[PDB]
RNA sequence: CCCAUGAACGAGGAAUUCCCAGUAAGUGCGGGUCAUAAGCUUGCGUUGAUUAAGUCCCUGCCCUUUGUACACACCGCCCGU
RNA sequence: CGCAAGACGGACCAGAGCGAAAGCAUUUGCCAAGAAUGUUUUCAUUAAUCAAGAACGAAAGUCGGAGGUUCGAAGACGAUCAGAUACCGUCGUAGUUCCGACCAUAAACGAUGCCGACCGGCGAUGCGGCGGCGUUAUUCCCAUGACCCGCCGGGCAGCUUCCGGGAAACCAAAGUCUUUGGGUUCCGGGGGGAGUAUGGUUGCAAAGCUGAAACUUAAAGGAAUUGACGGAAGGGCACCACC
């Protein structure tokens, strides 16, 4: 069996967290790095570690990543996320309102809208499931 | 013997199984049912009581019921598939698809089945004790 | 150790004009021998056909049963016996979630043909119904078999045994009494379950041969 | 029964008491419309065929 | 001993002394 | 200690529930205390279908259904492994397996 | 270390050890044995397999739910004559 | 294929209904009851619970009559077993069925008296009534019936809740209890001896009701917990398991 360790996925979890910026997506390159920068005290030790971080930053490659969270991309994370669309969605010229609300907004002082369109009623009140 | 007909008309019987838990019959008898034809059970065809209702045991008396009701021409059978019925049980035995894949196995022309074992309205007491059988 | 079947000779069996298909199969007895006729033999056979099998494009859950009124020229000529529906649509209409109306009438053709006519009809659940069951109150149970009962004495006994036949071949009774009881409580699978031929006119051979044809 | 030989398609998965029966989709190439479920015997890979003088009968599913 | 049986032995005894005790 | 606050039955509103036989050892036990069962299958099995399908008389003649109503005492039951002892919690699903 | 004869065995009816690749098996060597002393045992090369990529059928063991009047814990507890 | 007999009313049949409970299931008719609902009807406190007394009371059992299909205590026999006087099998008497008269007991249980008030939510379901789009049977129509959506009252229940309670299991009652009093009947006071003895009373009998003490004993018991075990179920692993 190949799956990795609490041991060997926590420290390639601390190491992507802390050391993002030097970590690529070569293997051997994450090997030296991690050697440099943390005491990993067995090269069989070391090379699991480069391994699952090789995997996790292929897993950022295919975008959120759910077991761990850098801030130093979250940053460009929310940069990506402020979406504005040019026009609202919530901006229709014309709105299609029941009859109930009609009479809801016109109690409410608000019977001169103009964007609101009456809707006909459903004729039966078929709406439960059938029990059973 | 036979009754003397045109080759691609098939002269009816009618194959009641009586697929017991016991013993299995595969009777062949008139359109009418009063005539009977042939009658083959599961103890003409094997030695032991536990194997009486077997499934091999119905496959034998299905066969040779089969080829006895072609040497007299009869090359249809409608089935009328029956368990013990009554208060006992109203699930036929291990026998009635094994006679059933028999008959249509050795050169017969299946008909017609219906299922006519013996259902009560509502019945005498049933063999067992108020507690049943506890063994 | 002799077969008993080589002095066996082989009848065809003749179903009454009302159904399509007149040949039902072949019968079978004992040659003549003394006191053994095989006239005598074959005259207290019923024969229990699928409907499907006597005419051509109705159901095969209904069966009759014709018994061999008389056999002349190796030819058995029948009548009708009765009509059953089989097991399995009988235990196929049976369902857990509503009521099951019986009815039961005793009622004589105008030829003098006494019959036992069983209905059965179920209630149906509606369309656009949430409620699991389509229970009917006893009074509603009560006037659907009245309905029953009246509309089988109606249909049978301003008619004789072959008009009667002549209707319970398409069913055409059920179809009337569905049709009646839908007012009362919607009914779903109406049928005439069984007949039973209780009592008959003595035999005459001239009715018999207008019976068949 | 008519010899007409079965191409495999997908290993269904192992049955058998002790786990030796193979369920395995087998596709007769004469139509491609029909793939019926056979249990197998012995090491199977995928995409074999094998010779089947008997098909009237159908291996335990669903 | 069950509750039953000890009152079915109970009542035989019982019906000992009702039958000796003349 | 109370099992069940159904004590193992249906029987609420009335005093007395007519028996029934179960169908495996014709033990006595009250109607809506046995556990039934309704069986819809063929007369004629699966493997065998084949064979009268080709052997009939008739062109899509369909099969009969058989129709069994099985009522078993609760030891038949459990024996027959048609339901199982649950947990104290999972007791209280009365929502039928999806089957 | 030397010099013919012979018991016995034709794959060993029950019941079944142990076996995932330099594995099983095929043999020799070296130690512990040891004043000489290996059918044992502990290591060693020496030839290379149709077989298995599976399962709970057996034998067990573990877990979950469940019952318990057991807690010395079923080799338990306990009833009656 | 008929005939006869005596039972029994399948499926429909439900956490559905009715009844004081025991109990009650094929049409159909008759008889007399009954709850709930509706009510701008009547009386006007007539009520609640109840020593005494009374009606009914499964099954088995008892006495007399009729019947006697099935099942079946007892009994005979065949198996199983070390032995089985049992479980299992073939029979099979009383009984099981009906009528009359006794018996009055059941884990007769919701192991929870009855009447009244108050205290959450939710969806169902049965009956009655009320209101409402629409669909359907509705033949110039309204009705009414079957649905659909609500509401009200009385029921059988269910789910949910940190109402509160409780040893807890659990209970919307088993809550409104040391912040202890709405009314009222029955009834318990450690475990055995023992529902025994005796007396009385009821019964044809079987037995029913009432019902001790000597003596003996440090626990018996309830609920829940963790283990261990199961001739309980479901998963997993193992060439010291199998294939």
Known sequence: ?132 | LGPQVAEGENVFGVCHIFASFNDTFVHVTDLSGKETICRVTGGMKVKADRDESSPYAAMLAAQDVAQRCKELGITALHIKLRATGGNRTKTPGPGAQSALRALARSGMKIGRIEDVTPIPSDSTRRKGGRRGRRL | VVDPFSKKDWYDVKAPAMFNIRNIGKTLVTRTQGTKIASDGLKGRVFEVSLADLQNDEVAFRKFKLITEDVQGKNCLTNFHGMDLTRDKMCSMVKKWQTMIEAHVDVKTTDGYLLRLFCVGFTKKRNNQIRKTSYAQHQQVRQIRKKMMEIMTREVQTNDLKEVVNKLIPDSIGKDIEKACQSIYPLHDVFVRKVKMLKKPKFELGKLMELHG | QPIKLARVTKVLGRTGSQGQCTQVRVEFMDDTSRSIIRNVKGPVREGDVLTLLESEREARRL | MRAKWRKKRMRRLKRKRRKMRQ | TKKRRNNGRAKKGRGHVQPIRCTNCARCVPKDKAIKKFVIRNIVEAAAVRDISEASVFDAYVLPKLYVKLHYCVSCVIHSKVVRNRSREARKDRTPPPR
């Open chain 1, 1 to 132: 069996g190949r799956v990795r360790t609490k041991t060997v996925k926590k420290a390639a979890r601390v190491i992507i967290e802390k050391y993002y910026t030097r970590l690529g997506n070569d293997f051997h390159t994450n090997k030296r790095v991690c050697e440099e920068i943390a005491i990993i005290p067995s090269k069989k030790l070391r090379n699991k570690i480069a391994g699952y971080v090789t995997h996790l930053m292929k897993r950022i490659q295919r975008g959120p990543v759910r077991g761990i969270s850098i801030k130093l991309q979250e940053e460009e994370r929310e940069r990506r996320d402020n979406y504005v669309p040019e026009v609202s969605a919530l901006d229709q010229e014309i709105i299609e309102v029941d009859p109930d609300t009609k009479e809801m907004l016109k109690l409410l002082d608000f019977g001169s809208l103009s964007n609101l369109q009456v809707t006909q009623p459903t004729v039966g009140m078929n709406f439960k499931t059938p029990r059973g």
